[PDB]
Amino acid sequence: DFAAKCAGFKTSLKLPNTKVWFTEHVPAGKNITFPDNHPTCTPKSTITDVEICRVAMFVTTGPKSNLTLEAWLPSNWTGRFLSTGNGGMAGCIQYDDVAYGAGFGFATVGANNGHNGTSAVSMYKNSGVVEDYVYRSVHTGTVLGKELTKKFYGKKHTKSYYLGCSTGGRQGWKEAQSFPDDFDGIVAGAPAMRFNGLQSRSGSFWGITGPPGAPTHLSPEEWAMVQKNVLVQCDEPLDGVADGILEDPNLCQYRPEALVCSKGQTKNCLTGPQIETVRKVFGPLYGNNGTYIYPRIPPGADQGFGFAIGEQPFPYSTEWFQYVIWNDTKWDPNTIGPNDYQKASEVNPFNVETWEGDLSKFRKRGSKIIHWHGLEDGLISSDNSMEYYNHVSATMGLSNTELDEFYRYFRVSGCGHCSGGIGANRIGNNRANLGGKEAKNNVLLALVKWVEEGQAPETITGVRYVNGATTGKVEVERRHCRYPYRNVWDRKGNYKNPDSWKCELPLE
Template structure:
């Protein structure tokens, strides 16, 4: 709801209108050109130094300790702890606060409380420093290899969902004390694990935020950080444990993919608007000249890396299309430059398999070769942590009823998390809640050529927060989002619409593109072993009892 002073201003205008001819009144618009509410800036009612003396008892169900409050630039930077070990960092504008709160997520397995706006950094009210913001390390500090979870069930709970929620509670209490009023609007933005955190909030705590931007969400974490990343490594090893495909072949594969599929969207520009339409066959690169071609074994690896993990009978252990065609230059995350290198995917998988897959039985000696690629192994590996770590529930009815708005986004060239994961979640939402209901509160954007949370060959800098704010504050539904990269800009439209060149002007200028919705949109293939993970009612709220996690 609008803050109380706005009603005073409206009432005053109404009184004035009875005394002065209406033609002489210059009534300011209720919203900015961006669709944001015009909220008066509020100054603090206390000094920054005095924040350390605040008693935030009751803000959440755990003790809160404020350790420091210091003016840094134009913000009062506050640091503290929510028991037992959630570090919180907040920034409160000292020269004028426009009554918005933005909480940011973090990536990986977190452990570091750093406010990172990511793709929301270009949002005007973020850029001008008038929003209050906060973040958390999610209940643990130090190494990001999962070892923090061993024998620490509360840290696992805080990382799964509690840390973000209690941070929202405490930050809002802190803001209310500092400015003498609570936020008019609250938002969350995050990518990767931050995207998982975003969806976890919408699912478990639907009234914490009015609007949420969830980028490349790792919502299927228990599968993502086990079979998905493990397959990236295991599918590329021969019987002797040597890598079959090395990174020097990736440009060759990428160039061949572009030759085959760059033009399917009607424009040869180095980008594939919808990689699902690409029918590239790696076997086409096999020839006797190993300097300019692939061996049959290397071509087989390329196919396996694209398709994703399967068991010996071909049953899918992750959704079909693990890495989209066109993303090959990003595969250095799991395809090494030389034998003997340890790739990123191996570290991600081992961190989870050793310390988080089984919450009460860590196994620091676990190796990727210990993971059996079977259906039985899938469920025994994935289920123990999925009920509290995954954010797969497609029923966001409570979030919708609270008037919440959700913007999902993903890069088509994401090398960490497959866009298919987000597509299947969006499909599940529409199946469970109804397409019409979902359209009233959620949108999905897919960015051609963009890698994980940014980077890549396509336009990869854009503002996801302003569209969410405008939808919440003025009802303006999100339309096109302009993405830029050096000298190129492109519009991205709500899925399933794509951008099409209008035939005139530079292909590097977003102004020369229009929306196009395919008459027969691609149907995402959701047939895989874990399909039923996209369901309602599976989530649990475990407790830490005597050093063990009790579900």
Template sequence: MRLITFTTVSLLLAASAAGNAAFQQRCSNLSSSFSAANTDIILADYVAKGTNITFPEPGNNCPKFTISLADMCRLRLNVTTSSTSSVIVEVFMPENWGSKGKRFLMTGNGGLGGCIQYNDMTYGTLLGFAVVGHDNGHAGDNGLPFLNKPQVVKDFAWRALYKAGKIGKKAINHFYPSSIRKSYYMGCSTGGRQGMKAAQEFPEEYDGIVAAAPSLDWNGVMAAPGHIFKAVGLPGSPTHLNLDQWNKVHQMVIRQCDGIDGVLDNVLEDPMKCEPRPEELLCGPGQTWASDQCLTSAQVAAVRKVYSPIYGNGGRLVHPRLNPLTREFFGYRASYGGVPSYIAEGWYRYAVFNDSNWSLHANFSLDAVDYDYQKDLFGIGTNKTDLTDAKNKGTRILMYHGLTDGLVTSENSYRYYEDVSRDMGLPSSQLDEFYRFFPISGLDHCYTGDGAWFVGGSVQYSPAGALDIDPSDSVLMTMVKWVEQGIAPETLMGRKLIGGTVQGARAHCKHPLKTTYKGVGDPNLPSSWDCGAA
């Protein structure tokens, strides 16, 4: 047995301090030691664990601070992509990288893409990844920087992701004594679309891609809130529903469909089987909302439009229906609350039409949708369904989507998966080799929800209690096991995180299998469910 003496401990502490000092010095030296074409170094700073990192950048609506979860080196770069565009790139390099697998992680963006997901970055460093984030070519989650700047739109569509990945990897390989061993991507919403864009166009950059709630068929995703806004109308219009009325609709859906999966828990395991009948809420003669909590014929018709597919000129399917469970958090604010979606309006106004006066209220039409599809700026649609390159490169793709998503309907991901299956001529048993899709019941858009929504994915580590959950079966580490150990996931573990505590768990099955209640046992326990046939 080895005797640990005071002298031994002192030597170990001294060696650790010396190593930390060398790490700090190496980080500071990046300002002069690292260089790359078309790249300016803004800062190279050592950041200790627990440090509050602030971003006092005026004029944008991005988060202004994050707390470091690891001792790390922070490198901030400005990468010029054209004469009229550039990308801010952040590289977080933890001190323990060499002992944690020498992994690279690229993070995605959200909305109109101008905010770096710093919480995803710090979470990655907590797990030992060297992590890269970028502003997608402009500051702030708004479309104004697109106005008459096509190169900025190009960055948003794909180039910022590609360039940031390249320069980030170069910086990491320069900084550490050894090179990156495996590369991963994780993002949700716009970040999910970015991940699928990488899978479609440059899969060789990543060994594993985690794409959540991807805004695939971007042009259709932009059309949906415009269509819904026009269907519901402004407050005061005959078709408008206020928040209390939408909550009544939510309760109606629960009442009509919650029992389909055999458990009354405010969660639909298979919302595709739910066809809400809003006529149940129709006011009879002499009845009103104030006295009877009922809806007018015009309001019922609006609800039916929201829960119906969107068809364009010539009968083409533009976008599937909104998920039948509507919650206040995302959907009301951005789709059906009577306020124009800033994302859709910003896209059409500044990128598609280059007209500061364009508005969803005055100008949205199916002709506008056709025009957007026709232009498909820099391939923003992300509609390619032949993933042969990803398959041949050995890239693994894990896509998941919340089944109560009120912003990007989960039916869009089902549609894409089946399109890939048909176009590649591969049944699910063969797609499973490299591409798996997990529907997550009770998950809203990216995070929060009434079910076992927490899967350890992008933007899920802000709520209270999230960092206390063991990350070993998180979606990111599940992908690591698939890539590095060949353990392909059959289920994705979700937890019902409410008020900072875990109140249940569920193992969500991969499509096309269905998470099915066994008929006995506590529904909050994963053992009470299995994966049944569709």
């Protein structure tokens, strides 16, 4: 029986540099709490959908660096191995994603990126902790995960898969670029790739806006005004459907001078300095010697906008420059500029940038990757993901049709950072953004069908339930297009209906 196997697995499992804390039988529907998690970590608890054996481990990686790996092994095992990622600067095991994977019969694993808690203070004067964050945590979890999965069931895994979002998307791309043999399938959502450029980008907004009271700064009401005016200029005029959703933000070049202050002083208008701020926020970041750092935040990208651009400076970027790049807690985010952006690119710990165009090894072995990004994502720019696709195409010397074999990037209209947004956003990257449980409308199942049955996804279907609910009646559904296709409304059918839209890439 399964409970006897799980209890006895504790003593028998002797992996190298690995101390097994415990093995726990967890039946279907049981609520598992996480009391040893950091106060900042989320979630505090998760409901498992199926019977599993929850293995907990401590993996020492260096003299002063270590991981906390967990492996959730289901009783109704399909043969598939899965690995989860992390988010932001966090050392939090994403337990909802590990349980989500376990629910579909995957032997799922998840690690804490080399530290505990959302802060990156652990990285200060510690190369081993940074090394785990950049690549080694997810890699070591995958190698050890396969060995324990092999030893537990008494047979090797059929296929290896990855599912990650935000920082997880970067971690998935790190694997596709530098560790191609680890995974057969990868889902990389809203990737934090070009990571040093992203922290440079996120840090620069404070330097542009300044603190509240300053002439360059915009309040939450003034930013809300700007995003409404973005829809006036760019929503219906560019996609023909006034739904508050920009279907293709590439076509939108917003001009904030439409809201110029005719009055003597501001009230519900943009001053000269505020116009300068919006163009910099909706414009690219360059640096020393005219070098290109990171793209704009696209107009309409309201989801997760307040975190980076707010009343105080952005903590993740400040900590990155303080602890990792400059190695100084005295570093001031108020005086951020070109010299900081240049230094981050030159330091680039363990190639955390993750901007490698050559995916030959990944293609050669026959691995697949589904890349996706929400178009309302205001925390990480979707334009960055567009530029990576083109960087890969240019580096490898392969057209979009050749890339379709192994690499497809989907642009999800009306979807925020990983979850949320006001459009047909639920594509099944995690529980929070879960819609249907079919290949066409669940990206995890789409990845499985592509790797095993050879069904390459033409689109990925997202949904919005009534009143933006977790489940129920489907209000809006749209088949989101892969780059460089554009989703075009047919000018007759109901825009909520999938069949009214069409993915177009004009060649004649």
